[PDB]
Amino acid sequence: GPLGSPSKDCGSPKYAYFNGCSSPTAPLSPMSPPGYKLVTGDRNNSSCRNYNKQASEQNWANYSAEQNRMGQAGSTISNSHAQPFDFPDDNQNAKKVAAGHELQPLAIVDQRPSSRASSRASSRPRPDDLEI
């Protein structure tokens, strides 16, 4: 035998170099077995100390039409650090979302007034009220 270091360098060379054993064992251990309940009330674990460190941010909806805005915002050039405070740069980009992040962004009322846009269809006199 190639007598030398019969200890596999304590912990194997690095991984295994098995190459491909057609092992269905794709996952690692924290796999999601047949879970038929989700929450139904009891979070099961409270859903807080699980550590996801994934996704990043896909629960807000970018709409895919704000980049142009971001382009401007940044094109203005003024806050290239936001380290000292970054307070002034937290009203616009924060308000354009505040008006919708509460529950609903729109609902056939983007204008708000509902009185303008000639929604009356010529409902105004001229002299005072057609009374001369």
UniProtKB/Swiss-Prot annotation:
Give the induction note.
In bladder smooth muscle cells, exhibits night/day variations with low levels during the sleep phase, at circadian time (CT) 4-8 (at protein level). Expression starts to increase around CT12 and forms a plateau during the active phase (CT16-24) (at protein level).
**Post-translation: what modifications?**
Contains at least one intramolecular disulfide bond.
Residues on the membrane's Cytoplasmic side span 5-132
- Note down the stretches annotated as region Interaction with UBQLN4: 14-132
- Give the Phosphothreonine positions (modified residues): T25, T76
Q: Where is the composition biased (Low complexity)?
A: 112-124
Tissues in which the UniProt entry reports expression: Detected in ventricle and atrium (at protein level).
Quaternary structure and partners: A connexon is composed of a hexamer of connexins. Interacts with SGSM3. Interacts with RIC1/CIP150. Interacts with CNST and CSNK1D. Interacts (via C-terminus) with TJP1. Interacts (via C-terminus) with SRC (via SH3 domain). Interacts (not ubiquitinated) with UBQLN4 (via UBA domain). Interacts with NOV. Interacts with TMEM65. Interacts with ANK3/ANKG and PKP2.
Membership in a protein family: Belongs to the connexin family. Alpha-type (group II) subfamily.
Kindly provide the name given to this protein in its UniProt entry.
Answer: Gap junction alpha-1 protein
Q: Native species of this protein? A: Rattus norvegicus (Rat)
Gene giving rise to this polypeptide:
Gja1
